[PDB]
């Protein structure tokens, strides 16, 4: 996270760390959506340009964390993966279209003060909140700068950007399965996600029922926090039919 701040304790209890077993390192972010299901970006698991193709046994999910590198004894919970499900129409070749994956845990995670699921939006919440100017929150343990690494979970609040402004900022083709966020060079404020924050959630607090909803998944950007560039997020609601299909077919 670039131009963010340290998260408060229990501020993002759905935040999940995707952790590589060997060498021991942070791979990505992810989010807890039930006691058995974790949501992340498909590119965190499969990205052939970088020779990335992780299998279940290669990874651990660490839930309830705050410190990036420390083992947070009696707080964090470490879970093993039962199965990885990548969107069948995930487009790693061009623009990371449908950058979404689900991970089913071997055992259910016990909820606590530091571990709690985020909601998934329904059509009404998405239509009400996914609007230009409305701000969401991005969290992660990723790089602090494009060209170092934080001691604890970082947080940044960022405004959703108008689709024409998103499209005009880049040469990449932007799809309806993406939305973009960040400040315009003229706004004065800064911030973005960066490498290592992918798979993490873009959340919004509904002013109707006071619950936190995961509207986006940290996906891609041209660098980190560049003027005139924006961060791109997977549109969770647009891919909810796939989410529900996977959960309905492979059990909750």
């Amino acid at each position: 996270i670039v131009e963010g701040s340290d998260a408060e304790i229990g501020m993002s209890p759905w935040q999940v760390m995707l952790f590589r077993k060997s060498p021991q390192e942070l791979l990505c972010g992810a989010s807890l959506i039930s006691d058995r299901w974790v949501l992340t970006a498909a590119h965190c698991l499969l990205y052939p340009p970088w020779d990335k193709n992780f299998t279940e046994n290669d990874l651990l999910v660490r839930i309830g964390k705050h410190s990036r590198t420390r083992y947070e004894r009696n707080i964090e919970k470490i879970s093993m993966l039962e199965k990885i499900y990548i969107h069948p129409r995930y487009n790693w070749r061009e623009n990371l279209d449908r950058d979404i994956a689900l991970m089913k845990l071997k055992k259910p995670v016990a909820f606590s003060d530091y571990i709690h699921p985020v909601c998934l939006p329904d059509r009404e919440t998405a239509a009400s909140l996914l609007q230009a100017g409305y701000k969401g929150r991005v969290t992660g343990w990723g790089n602090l700068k494009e060209t170092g690494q934080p001691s604890v979970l970082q947080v940044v609040n960022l405004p959703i950007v108008e689709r024409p402004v998103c499209k005009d900022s880049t040469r990449i083709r932007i799809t309806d399965n993406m939305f973009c966020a960040g400040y315009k060079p003229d706004e004065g404020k800064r911030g973005d996600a960066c490498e290592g924050d992918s798979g993490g959630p873009f959340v919004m607090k509904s002013p109707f029922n006071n619950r936190w909803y995961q509207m986006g998944i940290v996906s891609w950007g041209e660098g980190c926090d560049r003027d005139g560039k924006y961060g791109f997020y997977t549109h969770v609601f647009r891919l909810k039919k796939w989410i529900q299909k996977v959960i309905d077919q492979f059990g909750e």
Binding site: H116, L129, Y134, R137, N210, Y213
Partner: peptide, 29 residues
């Protein structure tokens, strides 16, 4: 847990607000 989703034990469950959630609410016009 769908029923209780998105309600934080250290915040919403205790009617405590975090330091920057007000910035999100203010943006929802």
């Amino acid at each position: 847990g769908e029923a209780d989703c998105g309600l934080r034990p250290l915040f919403e469950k205790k009617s405590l607000e975090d330091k920057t959630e007000r910035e999100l609410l203010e943006s929802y016009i």
